[PDB]
């Protein structure tokens, strides 16, 4: 007799099709607040609309508020950066734009040496025994 | 000894094969043939029109139940299920085609798409002795034995078989032709359309 | 000039835009835009028809708004058409989800097990997972009240790209769940949504290219990990694997220690194998004689069904699941 | 054998008996371009690869069948059998009719503390599996022997209940795969 | 070179190398890249050539890069990102000045979408 195991799937992004991974920005200013000039000129200066036209499948917010000039981002797996960009000038806004934009929205995280491949499948060849080696020990 | 039991049931006890490979028809299942069985069922769903092409082995285990032979031959169910759901889906297209997105939750297309409606169809075009499976009861009327439901099953068996073999395209055209359409009145539409119709008398 | 008249005017604008989903109005609406860039929807598929798929059905307001005191408020939404909801169109997508999905995984592995099959198609496209999907794809809720949304006095573009259904304000506030209805549910709500995008592709490309929806399926559905064999639950295989053979053209199944080491210590090492004839089926390690004897039948009972043909050969059509 | 590849093993170019874990030994071995076989050194239990699958759970219409990689390294000549049933060694017998069935089971429902299914099963030349296929016991008596279990289990200490809970857990995880 | 026991499997394995540094992948792995891709974007493919050995579970086509042509392997670059932040501190046993050694180095996560014997 068989029963089955009630499991879920666990979806891979990239192999089907490739959902990106960033979904929306918010760009923060203040009209007062020296430390918003730079976030201001961006806004104000052409760039913002490039980069709408070059991904328009991110949606790109613009709001005011008292305090310091601010970018978060929203990813599809739900996690927000928000990246205060305080005393930045337009070039340096762009920059952490374009870094935001690139990130995969997930926590940063130490790595040991050479933990490279993150697999969900089963090895191709089995996993090693010692009865079925070639060489046997001794 | 090799006593091979040839009764009635004594729990436990291994029978003589020819005692439990018989439909309620009675025919053996071995001494099935192609002329006097599958040709003619072939016939019947007029497989010549659509391209189709089925093996007799294939259209004997869409025949064939879970409960002939306690699943020992090859039955349908993993067809059925597929048949099904290829069915529900040729009925949803159907009703929106005749785009209208407001004529899906409704009786009509329920019956369309049901085991009541599936039983009629297979006894009109009379596929009823050809199918392999056992009754409860032999001497009852035939809705208490559950023969419906297995009916039902062997034209979703026959379709899942289709659309294993002949590829999607080729089920759907068939599903269009012979089921849901007007002009055979022995259709499935006909059937659908009747039941409702009984329906609202009742 | 009254602010309630105001107010009330906005509503009213608001109804006749969620009734209507005018196609200016919903190009307009950038969270829109965005999901059609997101999923590299057709063409053919109008941003109206987006919207709609983001509409659910909200016909009339329930009887749980009167007390709020009981644990509900319904003050998001606003009502829909009864002709221009998702909720055809949902049926619509659940049926291609069960029709393809299903048809895949008979495909990838012909002889698995009914039971077994159902889970796996349950797993590709369960009410969770689709919900999941949606928020992934950015599919987000219409929280906000419809009061607080005309004091912002924000366009009704926003409104018609989010999802819309009587999502309850405070659901569980203080710690406190009414458990309502699937009418009323996040998770169901999301679900319809994938459901009705689906099945908004499959109407506009239906006549152009048939598969179109099957391949965009494949692509967000289908290309899912399920490793089918954490699907599997034996209670006495060697018996299930003894009338497999018996069914079959095969000698009867007897398992032998191949390899034995450890024996007499708390952790021992026997490796059996279950031959019928000098040809092995199955390969079963163990601390245990029995164990291993069990291992060895259920091994071969997943080499028997969850073998996978090549595309190459022509179809397996398998005889059944093996009746005991 | 099909193919006439080349065979080698999983080589380091250190010492494997000292470095077998030594990735780097490994990295560093290159071997001349083409195909190879390389024997896997695995039990195949797990897994659902088409190398592992048998040629008899195989279709007719494959083409893995003709290749020869579902390999017969054992032989069912060397290996012994394995908790096999006395039914296997020696052949199934259908011999008992239907009133030997009927007195068997006339007998069970009368006395099974008496005529217990190993008593059965000496009398008759049967199996005890088969005898309770046959015949079910007096109710009462399978109730006893309930009562009897509960009471072996309440006389256990905390320790006992917990390995048997385990035992239990290990069971179920072996029919997993 | 009769790559058809390679063709037939329906698992198998690649071990292709970027700059050298190789990555031992199957379809749907996630290779994480320890430095900042230039010339592909997000949402880029990536077509793996100096492909060391392709295997199965008992046979590998494995040599000089093999023949591109012999197979395909598809990766997608999904997501550039970064390591946590890390701060050790550099100082000598008697001396007070205690100079901070901050890192944050740049990490890019392939998709491997494709891979099989063409």
Known sequence: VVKAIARNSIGRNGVGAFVFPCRKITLQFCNWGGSSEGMRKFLTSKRLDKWGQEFPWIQFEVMRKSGHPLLRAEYTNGREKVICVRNLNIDNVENKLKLLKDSDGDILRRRTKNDNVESLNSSVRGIWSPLHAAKRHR | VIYLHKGPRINGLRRDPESYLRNPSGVLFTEVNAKECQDKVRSILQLPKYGINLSNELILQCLTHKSFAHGSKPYNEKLNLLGAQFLKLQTCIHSLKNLQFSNLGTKFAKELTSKNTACTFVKLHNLDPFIFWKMRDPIKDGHINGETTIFASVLNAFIGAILSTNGSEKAAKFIQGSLLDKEDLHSLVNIANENVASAKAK | ?324 | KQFGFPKTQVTTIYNKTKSASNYKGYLKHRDAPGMYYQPSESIATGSVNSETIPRSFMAASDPRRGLDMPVQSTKAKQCPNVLVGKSTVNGKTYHLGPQEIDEIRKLRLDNPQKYTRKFLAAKYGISPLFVSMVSKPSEQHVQIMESRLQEIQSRWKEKRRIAREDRKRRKLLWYQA | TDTTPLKLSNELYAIFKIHNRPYLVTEGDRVILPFKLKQAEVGDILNMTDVTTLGSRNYKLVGHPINTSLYTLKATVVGKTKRAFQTREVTKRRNRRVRHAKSKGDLTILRISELSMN
């Open chain 3, 1 to 324: 000039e009254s602010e309630l008249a105001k107010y009330k005017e906005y509503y009213q604008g608001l109804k006749s835009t969620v009734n209507e989903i005018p196609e200016s109005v919903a190009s307009k609406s950038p969270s829109l835009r965005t999901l059609h860039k997101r999923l590299q929807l057709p063409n053919e598929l109008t941003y109206s028809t987006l919207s709609r798929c983001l509409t659910c059905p909200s016909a009339k307001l329930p009887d749980k708004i009167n007390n709020p005191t009981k644990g509900a408020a319904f003050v998001n939404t606003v009502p829909t058409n009864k002709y221009l909801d998702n909720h055809g169109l949902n049926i619509m997508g659940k049926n291609l989800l069960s029709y393809h999905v299903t048809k895949s995984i008979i495909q990838k592995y012909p002889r698995l097990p009914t039971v077994v099959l159902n889970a796996a198609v349950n797993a590709y496209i369960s009410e969770a997972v689709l919900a999941h999907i949606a928020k992934y794809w950015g599919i987000e809720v219409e929280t906000t009240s419809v009061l607080s949304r005309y004091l912002k006095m924000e366009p009704f573009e926003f409104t018609l790209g989010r999802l819309k259904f009587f999502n309850n304000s405070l659901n569980s506030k203080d710690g406190i769940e009414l458990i309502t209805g699937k009418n009323f549910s996040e998770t169901s709500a999301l679900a319809m949504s994938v459901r009705s995008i689906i099945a908004a592709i499959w109407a506009v490309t239906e006549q152009k290219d048939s598969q179109a929806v099957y391949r965009f399926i494949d692509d967000h559905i289908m290309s899912r990990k399920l490793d089918i064999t954490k699907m599997f639950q034996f209670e006495q295989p060697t018996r299930e694997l003894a009338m497999l053979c018996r069914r079959e053209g095969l000698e009867k199944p007897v398992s032998k220690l191949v390899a034995e080491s450890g024996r007499l210590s708390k952790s021992p090492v026997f490796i059996v194998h279950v031959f019928s004839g000098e040809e092995t089926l199955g390969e079963g390690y163990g601390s245990s004689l029995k164990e291993a004897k069990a291992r060895a039948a259920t091994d071969a009972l997943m080499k028997w069904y969850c073998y996978e043909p090549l595309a190459q050969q022509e179809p397996v059509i398998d005889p059944g699941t093996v009746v005991v």
